[PDB]
């Protein structure tokens, strides 16, 4: 229903995209023009990769060598945090008949020559362009098989993210609701992160015009905007660049993910129409709806890991989280059945357990992941062998406490026998101890892998132990009232995790003498 390509739509690729702010079509912020339609229009101002400034090139390549689309053939230190790797344009190969030494240029001068098969010089610069509407090539997109780590127990625990997976998360960026999505720009095991704010003025003038250059990225202790690119996508641009915004930003990520770089796109969403622009601009045309669901399908099919163009084995991911908004907050509107069809995960962030200051707000019954499977190997063989079995366990336990409730809803909890007082006690320890997590404490804002499964141990284990000590006449208010309980919930404070396992002896031995005191 829209049946054409483009009419030149590309962006600049090389040193100078990190600390950048662009809006949908890469040109910098403040620089106000139009768009409108199926393709191009008009413009003026900005150069969108600084001209003046001076890059340090170290070459990686000597006259002589062969290379192909991808190889690296030279570093650009471009911020404290990034090494930029310098690399032959897609489409490009042949012999390195030129090559720039260790020196100081700007973006414009050409540091090597390609001599292709049939003799053609290719004269090649620290930067290249790309149609942003066209997925830029790879050698092979690997299955989902790693998991992008966040350090939020509930997302790496039961609604994983894979690397170079897809993933949706309700209402917009800029919500002061709930602080999981800015946890998830800062923690996830990203090296570099591409960042589309969309930001609506009222409550927010703009999503942190000035707190981003200011904010920290926790793992290294500069600020977050040197491993960051901005695209902005305000009320005040035209709407055919708000449209072509996750095209420049997942190419931009596709160009990181190209060098070797596990990259997470971030893209913002407002309560902005839906309907409005669509089948009839305001049947008689023909049927639309349709199309543009295949046309996000398609972008969200752009995330993705693999192994890179180039003649060294590499491989690189864009892991691609979209903010999800409907008009009315309806949840049953085009804008998030169409995304949920083709995300993989769904992170739940819900209003009640906010308003209960239950922290990530994640409901843990109506969020999803089908990446669980994909990643259960990686756990495994690097973390912990039961991973998966404690998860599922868990969740278990969850399902059944709702289940419960349910039902206490209709009775009351008078009849209550020992055994679901005893399922309730832990499913409430696993909700508290567990899926809560600080994330303003300095402890807690970040949960290692390592320590995430001992935690799930020490709560399992008791859960095992209650089980049993309900099964041999233990009653649950000596359970309830056992020492290590009250120590269990402040394990997500403990930064050793060896004094966290050790809760699980301690558990054991109090369980014991619970034994000694009855049988």
């Known amino acids: 229903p829209v049946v054409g390509t483009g009419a030149s739509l590309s962006v600049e690729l090389g040193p100078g995209l990190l600390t950048s702010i662009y809006d949908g079509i890469q040109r910098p912020l403040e620089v106000i023009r139009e768009k409108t339609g199926d393709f191009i229009a008009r413009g003026v101002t900005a150069p969108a990769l600084p001209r003046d400034k001076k890059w340090h090139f170290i070459p990686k390549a000597k006259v002589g060598d062969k290379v192909v689309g991808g190889d690296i053939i030279g570093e650009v230190p471009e911020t404290s945090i990034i090494v930029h790797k310098i690399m032959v344009p897609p489409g490009i190969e042949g012999e390195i008949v030129e090559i720039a030494e ?3 240029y700007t973006i414009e001068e050409v540091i090597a020559k ?30 989902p098989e790693v998991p992008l780590i966040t350090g939020q127990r509930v997302i790496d625990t039961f609604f994983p993210q894979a690397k170079g997976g897809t993933a949706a ?36 003038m703009t999503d942190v015009l000035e707190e981003f250059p200011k904010l920290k990225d926790p793992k290294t202790g500069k600020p977050l905007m040197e491993r960051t690119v901005l695209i902005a996508n305000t009320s005040n641009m035209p709407v055919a660049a708000r449209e072509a915004s996750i095209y420049t930003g997942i190419t931009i990520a596709e160009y990181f993910r190209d060098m070797g770089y596990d990259v997470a796109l971030m893209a913002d ?9 669509r089948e009839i601009s305001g049947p008689g045309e023909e049927g639309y709806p349709a199309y543009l669901a295949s046309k996000l399908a398609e972008f969200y099919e752009r995330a993705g890991r693999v192994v890179t163009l180039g003649s060294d084995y590499r491989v690189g991911s864009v892991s691609v989280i979209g903010a999800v908004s ?70 278990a336990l969850l399902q059944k406490e709702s289940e419960l409730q349910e039902i206490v809803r209709i009775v009351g909890p008078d009849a209550l026998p020992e055994r679901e007082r005893a399922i309730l006690l832990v499913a409430r320890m696993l909700r508290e101890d567990y899926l809560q997590q600080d994330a303003w404490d300095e402890v807690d804002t970040y949960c290692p892998p390592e320590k995430q499964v001992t935690m799930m141990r020490v709560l399992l284990n008791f859960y095992d132990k209650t089980m049993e000590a309900i099964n041999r006449g233990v ?9 290590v309980r009250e120590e269990i919930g402040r394990m997500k404070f403990e930064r050793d995790v060896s004094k966290i396992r ?13 034994f000694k005191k009855y049988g």
């Open 102 to 104: 260790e020196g100081d």
């Open 114 to 143: 390609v001599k292709t098969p049939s003799g053609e010089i290719k004269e090649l610069k620290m930067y290249q362009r790309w149609p942003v509407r066209v997925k830029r090539p790879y050698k092979e997109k690997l299955p």
């Open 169 to 204: 998360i309700p209402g917009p960026f800029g919500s002061g609701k709930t602080v999981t999505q800015h946890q998830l720009a800062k923690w996830s095991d990203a090296q570099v992160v591409i960042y589309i704010g969309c930001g609506e003025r009222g409550n927010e």
């Open 269 to 277: 969403s407002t309560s902005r129409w839906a309907e409005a622009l």
């Open 326 to 395: 409907p008009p009315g907050g309806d949840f049953s509107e085009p804008v998030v059945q169409n995304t949920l069809r083709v995300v993989k995960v769904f992170w739940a962030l819900d209003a009640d357990l906010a308003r209960r200051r239950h922290f990530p707000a994640i409901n843990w019954l109506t969020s999803y992941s089908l990446y669980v499977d994909a990643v259960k190997d990686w756990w495994h063989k690097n973390i912990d062998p039961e991973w998966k079995a404690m998860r599922d366990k868990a969740m």
């Open 475 to 483: 009653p649950l208010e000596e359970i309830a009232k056992l020492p």
């Open 502 to 514: 050790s809760l699980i002896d301690k558990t054991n031995e109090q369980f014991e003498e619970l």
